[PDB]
Assembly symmetry: C3
Homo-oligomer: 128 residues x 3
């Protein structure tokens, strides 16, 4: 299976091949400064068409907090197969626990794909 | 595959069907006000019997922080198949980074199911 | 059926027990750790593991971690790859404290499961989607 990837512009660093099954590091599309106790969407400079029936999960890298002092406000970001449009660029939602600077090209988070949950039948009951 | 769902009461909004594999939005069962730097378990007004051998994963929605100023203290909630009792209602563990008000019926987080990890044995060794 | 090889820091580490029905598995603080409000500490878990080939592990807080200890996990979910299998590749829990707190040696502070790694994928650059 394959992922089609469109970059925001030619200066974005092309990301790792995916022949191995490791999570894949994504990078700041531009410089982003965030003050202590403030929030910014860090653009990742990439848009993707994921395989039919899959979704992507995005979390911080292990070293992100140590080096940048940010947490990811939504814990883990879900990118559905449907977020496949020409302007559907990815972002990393960052809350700074201290004044910080992220520079263009800095690796800031990581992703993998996973099969979406199967079709399920929700049936209401009065008791369990 | 089916999930049996019990709602806290008649006023809880019945949630989305699960035909497409998308994550499913869960909603506040009552008004909850949270002060900056305080914590509250936000009731979701649902109890579920998940399919055998499955667990649920719960994370904020992408827009939760922007709209509500809360993060999920456990990052991703994991609800086991065994949490299927008639009083086993679900909660979103919220920490407010600013004063906030959540209203009854607001979408606050999302879940999916996933198969539990395969059978595995833990074997102590004296060296790797 | 599959196997996880687990090695402990020392004999004082309380050995981990697997939940027979496939539940996530709790891990324990390897030593006492004091963390001041708004400070960070990489809490040692006192375990190194060789995971099954083609698998990874996922680490999240327990539901009770915040109530008990007032900490959040700064990386959201830890990813432990199959390759992190060396004799000195000990696991940690990266804790940010939202209040002054003390964690005691042996406290169950986080939980893990394994999951198959994503399959091989071909990344293909395109000009438009
Ligand atoms: O951490 C995230 C979470 C989401 N998205 C993308 C995928 C979503 O489809 C879109 C937001 O749409 P809603 O989920 O808010 O509809 O943003 C990200 O780039 N990063
Ligand atoms: O984000 C979560 C995580 C867990 N639970 C369920 C399953 C737990 O067994 C139960 C109670 O958790 P503790 O009181 O053991 O933390 O809540 C949730 O509703 N939300
Ligand atoms: O919450 C975590 C996340 C990672 N690790 C381990 C596995 C990683 O291989 C290593 C850090 O390596 P990088 O991911 O920074 O390469 O730490 C942990 O013990 N706990
Ligand atoms: Na990369
Ligand atoms: Na609605
Ligand atoms: Na102990």
């Amino acid at each position: 299976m394959q992922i089609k990837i469109k970059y925001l512009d030619e200066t974005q660093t092309r990301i790792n091949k995916m022949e191995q099954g490791d999570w894949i590091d994504l990078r700041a599309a531009e410089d982003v400064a965030i003050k202590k106790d403030e929030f910014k969407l860090v653009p990742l400079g990439v848009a993707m068409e994921l395989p039919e029936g899959y979704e992507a999960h995005v979390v911080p890298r292990s070293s992100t907090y140590k080096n940048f002092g940010v947490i990811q406000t939504n814990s883990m970001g879900v990118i559905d197969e449907s977020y496949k449009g020409d302007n559907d660029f990815w972002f990393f939602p960052a809350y700074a626990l201290r004044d910080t600077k992220i520079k263009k090209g800095d690796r800031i988070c990581q992703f993998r794909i996973m099969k979406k949950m199967p079709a399920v039948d929700l049936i209401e009951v009065d008791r369990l």
